[PDB]
Amino acid sequence: DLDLAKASATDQLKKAKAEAQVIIEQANKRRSQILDEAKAEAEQERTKIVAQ
Amino acid sequence: DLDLAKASATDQLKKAKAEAQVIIEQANKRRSQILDEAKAEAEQERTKIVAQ
Amino acid sequence: AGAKDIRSKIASVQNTQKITKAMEMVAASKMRKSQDRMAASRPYAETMRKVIGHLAHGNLEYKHPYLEDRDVKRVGYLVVSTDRGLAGGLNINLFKKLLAEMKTWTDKGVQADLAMIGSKGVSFFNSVGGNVVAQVTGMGDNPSLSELIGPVKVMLQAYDEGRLDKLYIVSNKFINTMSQVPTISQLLPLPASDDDDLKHKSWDYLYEPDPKALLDTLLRRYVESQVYQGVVENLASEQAARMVAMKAATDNGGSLIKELQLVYNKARQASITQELTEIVSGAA
Amino acid sequence: QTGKTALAIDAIINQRDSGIKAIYVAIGQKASTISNVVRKLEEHGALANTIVVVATASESAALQYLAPYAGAAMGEYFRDRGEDALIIYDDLSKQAVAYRQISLLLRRPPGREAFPGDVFYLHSRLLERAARVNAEYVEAFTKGEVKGKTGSLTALPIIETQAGDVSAFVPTNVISITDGQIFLETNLFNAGIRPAVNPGISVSRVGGAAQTKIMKKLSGGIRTALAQYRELAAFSQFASDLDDATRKQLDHGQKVTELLKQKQYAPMSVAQQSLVLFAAERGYLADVELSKIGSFEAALLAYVDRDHAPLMQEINQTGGYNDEIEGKLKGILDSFKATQSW
Amino acid sequence: TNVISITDGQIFLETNLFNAGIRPAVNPGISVSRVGGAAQTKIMKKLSGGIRTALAQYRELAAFSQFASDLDDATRKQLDHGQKVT
Amino acid sequence: QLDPLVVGQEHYDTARGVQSILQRYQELKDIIAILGMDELSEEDKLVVARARKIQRFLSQPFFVAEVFTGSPGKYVSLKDTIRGFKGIMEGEYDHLPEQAFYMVGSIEEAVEKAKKL
Amino acid sequence: QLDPLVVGQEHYDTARGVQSILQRYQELKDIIAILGMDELSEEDKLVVARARKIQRFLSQPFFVAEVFTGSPGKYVSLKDTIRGFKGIMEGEYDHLPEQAFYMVGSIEEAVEKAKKL
């Protein structure tokens, strides 16, 4: 019971690490998309104003 | 020996659950830091490109 | 760098060729001197393997751990290995055969244990991260029959108390002056796979009084002889494997010297022609 | 293709807020390469602080040759009014090739390697213009308009070697003149050590007098230790037993070698560099596994920027170092290494 | 190269020898006299052939000096003689 | 163009990995020439065993070269190259012989060649 | 000036000794780099050790170089210099590490850096 309790705690920490990394990477995924939206909006706006 | 083992096992498990819960909330603090910096450099990218 | 440096590089390769040639002869002296020790140890060990060729037969056997079999859960290996490098692919071609067998037992969950003789065995299996129950190193040119026994003091006590259910010896073997074979074989339980002495079955044996002591002490000399002869025949294999490998280096060094000299003779001729053009074209 | 230009335009980019004006002189480059570097200067904030002086590969051999001097004349205007300028002469070697063309077409006698003999006088008079002038010289030049200010011009010339061969005539001249060199080399660059700075043959002749005290204190240990690590690693290469002093040194040296790698266009402030060196020179790296050392650094910079920014401002503004600074950095490293993850 | 071609013989003095304490510093086996024993007195001519051959044997054995503990005693004698002549 | 911004990270990391293993193989070749390989460390032997597979997998049949080698040519999509070299450096293929990689268009073709050696 | 008629025999013997040790070590250093130091004679292994110490003991920090080093510069008398090199050539400091010599000053303080090292 002492050994399996620490086994449960270590698999919980492994899950917690997994959770930690994924959350960071969805944030990282989000970061890339937003900056691409900003770059796309700026280039469209800029190109039509210079034509104007 | 069985009684004492139960108490520590619980104490160990409660510690492990506390650190795992801290790590998920710390991951959300990293997420929200990354998202606010992404937002901060998206406004700053737009404002510089239109100023340009 | 330039020709001055390249000329200095060639001199270091020429130095290397000599030294890797001297230690080719010195090795070949040791491999003949150690072959005499092997050839003198061989008849005694050959008799011991005939003696157990008897002890495997008969129905007059008493009870005795080393002689009788056992249901197998934990197995031990004595690995002999070198104190010295430069022997080439000797150690690792032995160790991969050991690990293949070790993995084979570990496949079914049978436990395993190692005891090592020699520096390179200790390091390799510590790197793989196996067990090591006992160790000896610094055997040099030739160890004494008493000074290597630490590894067998544990491994014999382990098979006695049922800490072990099989015990093996693991070495290269000197089958030719320029070829040697890696081998693994079992000492305990003294394998009943060996023949019964059926030609002499009419003569079924009578113990002398105190048969426990006479049988135990005799079998201690058997395992002592098998381990020591295996060490000595591995030491003949190392000095032979070194000479073969040192011979190749001397040749490979020779190739490197001719190549480099052809490069230098170009660099020399170019530097003469290049600067003389700068001089003559400077008369203007 | 070892990163010669990359280093020099990152040095320009990082001046965006230091107050130092920049000049980039392009001798003999192709015009689309200039247009690309000017674009990167414009993606960053760096172009507004920079003059770009060009003589492309199409232009006559006299437009080149004369370009470095045209750039220096612009840098001197700031130098003689109490302002700092940083001038990057790119491919001073190509300036020498253009000057050899002119000299041979004028039938002047060739010297070694077919260059004219005065080619040392060409570069030495160019490079001795970069100088720090005392306040009196500024006051005299400005006729009392500017008083109490010392002006400076800093030069970063670039030379290309053909095969690491430093013995060529143009490299030997320019190595003779300058206050140091940074050697970048192909073996390190292919191994992934980028920037590929060879610690052994690189040297600064000004040294610690140029640093802030915090960097001065930490970095003095780094460079000579790292050179001896490379000697020790060779002598080690077939030694199996490694004594603990040696084992520690080879370990520390691999971890410092890994720590000094850095991505292009990603410059680090003083406080960031100081904190990361403090991690190495106080052994906080020592237990950390080597590929994680890269992630360790990224996580440490992130952690300190959210939690401990008042100290970063203190260090960046002051460059100061004291027992409370060592204590606060010790506390930050102890706290990070316990609480966070790489 | 010109003077090597013109002269009757060569005394090569070497720095490796000089730094290692062999002070006269003459490198044998590359040094030569094309006049040789005609130049030399009867006693010196008689005795010097021993030196010439001893140092030749010393040079090849010098590579074995690193591990000359395991050698034929005849070789060990030649090596310890080469050193004492040197 | 070998820049993370234009190519993106997977391509850039794969190219720098290939460059790092092949550089380290040049550093070992002077040891191997005098000593032979048996003296190397068991990780150095793995670097060599991968680098040699990398050198072979850079080979390719060309449609204009068919007149020389007889063998039919190959056109390889960029995705197949990155996936292929990334697998070799990760050791996904450490069980195949070197000959399996020589003159095969894609990594699928290496494993089919390996079945017949 | 390095001959016994000026320097005296005490100094001359000490300088010739140091040169001979460093020359020998430069040859041994070539063997080591490929065959490894285990392959040497135990006499040659001791010469390699004591040479590699003497090489570091010749280093000395200058009080015109504190700006580079950050450390206090040292002056040595000729008398103390001779005594120090004799001490490495004999046994007195066989037990100190190599790094205990580097940029030290006198021999009398190399023991102190060893205690610090």
Ligand SMILES: Nc1ncnc2c1ncn2[C@@H]1O[C@H](COP(=O)(O)OP(=O)(O)OP(=O)(O)O)[C@@H](O)[C@H]1O
């Ligand atoms: N710190 C770095 N990290 C990764 N890649 C880099 C780094 N610095 C430069 N590079 C890359 O190295 C390549 C060459 O850089 P750069 O153009 O500065 O070299 P160079 O020596 O100027 O070349 P040339 O000799 O053609 O002028 C470029 O692809 C660049 O992206």
Ligand SMILES: [Mg+2]
């Ligand atoms: Mg460039």
